[PDB]
Design a protein around this ligand. Structure first.
Ligand SMILES: Cc1cc2nc3c(=O)[nH]c(=O)nc-3n(C[C@H](O)[C@H](O)[C@H](O)COP(=O)(O)OP(=O)(O)OC[C@H]3O[C@@H](n4cnc5c(N)ncnc54)[C@H](O)[C@@H]3O)c2cc1C
Length: 247
């Protein structure tokens, strides 16, 4: 069920965060925003975890962005990856952060906490996104030099799509929130006054959430009260959600 890929590059941005790129099987096809399984063979068995695919689907390699968890079975080992090392990559990506599950609208909001920024690193490089939205807002919890350096590097990695540089410049806004401070910024209305945007309505706003279970719970409650409905394959809506990690 796994491709054995070869690690092409490895980057340590901070003492808790690393990214890597690796070879991409021809069968690995996906929509920007989706996740797949990534792991290593440990004691003769696959040890794997869900990871958002950071790279856009037109990039010829894959990229992933990882936390280093202290006694984390996978990340305590994955952090030691070297160029040329093998890594297991799940052959079937999936996920709910899928724009086709959002009714047409004018503003796209991406509300992320922690490593939940990861799927949005792929989506903000999807040219289709700017063809269907007036403005894109990415909220995040990155505060450290190395975290911001990563997002800055990502936004310019645009193979075959250099023209998107000007589009991203014009249409994409990054809003620092620093981890469940976003819910409060919504409830108080300060998110919207800060950015000079109208409060959420299903008329206008499409929202993607990727963060903790707690952040998802509290924030969707506010979206539902504004009249927004969760989208799904069989019924596009106003918002979609995915956990950044499992409690
Ligand atoms: C759909 C999905 C997409 C994901 N995408 C990513 C990703 O792009 N990058 C990434 O680093 N992780 C991601 N995760 C979390 C990831 O799958 C692993 O749990 C993470 O790699 C840590 O694995 P581990 O074996 O070291 O620790 P685990 O044994 O998996 O967990 C150790 C503890 O750390 C907490 N934790 C785990 N991951 C994180 C995190 N990223 N941020 C904060 N706390 C965490 C968990 O609650 C867990 O209880 C994703 C999870 C899901 C469900």
């Amino acid at each position: 069920k796994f491709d054995t890929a070869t690690v092409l590059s490895v980057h340590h941005w901070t003492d808790t965060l690393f990214s890597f790129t690796c070879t991409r099987d021809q069968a690995l096809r996906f929509n920007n925003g989706e996740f797949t399984m990534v792991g290593l063979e440990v004691d003769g068995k696959p040890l794997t975890r869900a990871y958002s695919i950071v790279s856009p689907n037109y990039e010829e390699h894959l990229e992933f962005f990882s936390i280093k968890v202290q006694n984390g079975p996978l990340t305590s080992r994955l952090q030691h990856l070297k160029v040329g090392d093998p890594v297991l990559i799940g052959k079937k990506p999936t996920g709910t952060l899928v724009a086709d599950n959002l009714l047409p609208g004018k503003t796209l909001w991406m509300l992320s906490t922690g490593t939940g920024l990861a799927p949005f690193m792929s989506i903000i490089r999807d040219p289709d996104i700017y063809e269907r939205f007036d403005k894109v807002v990415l909220t995040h919890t990155c505060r450290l030099k190395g975290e911001l350096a990563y997002m800055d590097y990502i936004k310019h990695d645009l193979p075959g799509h250099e023209y998107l540089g000007d589009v991203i410049r014009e249409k994409l806004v990054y809003y620092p929130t620093v981890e469940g401070r976003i819910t409060d910024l919504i409830a108080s209305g300060k998110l919207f006054t800060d950015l000079d945007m109208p409060p959420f309505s299903p008329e206008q706003d499409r929202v993607m959430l990727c963060g903790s279970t707690a952040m998802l719970k509290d924030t969707t409650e506010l979206l539902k009260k504004a009249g927004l409905v969760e989208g799904k394959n069989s019924a596009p809506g106003h918002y979609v959600i995915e956990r950044a990690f499992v409690d």
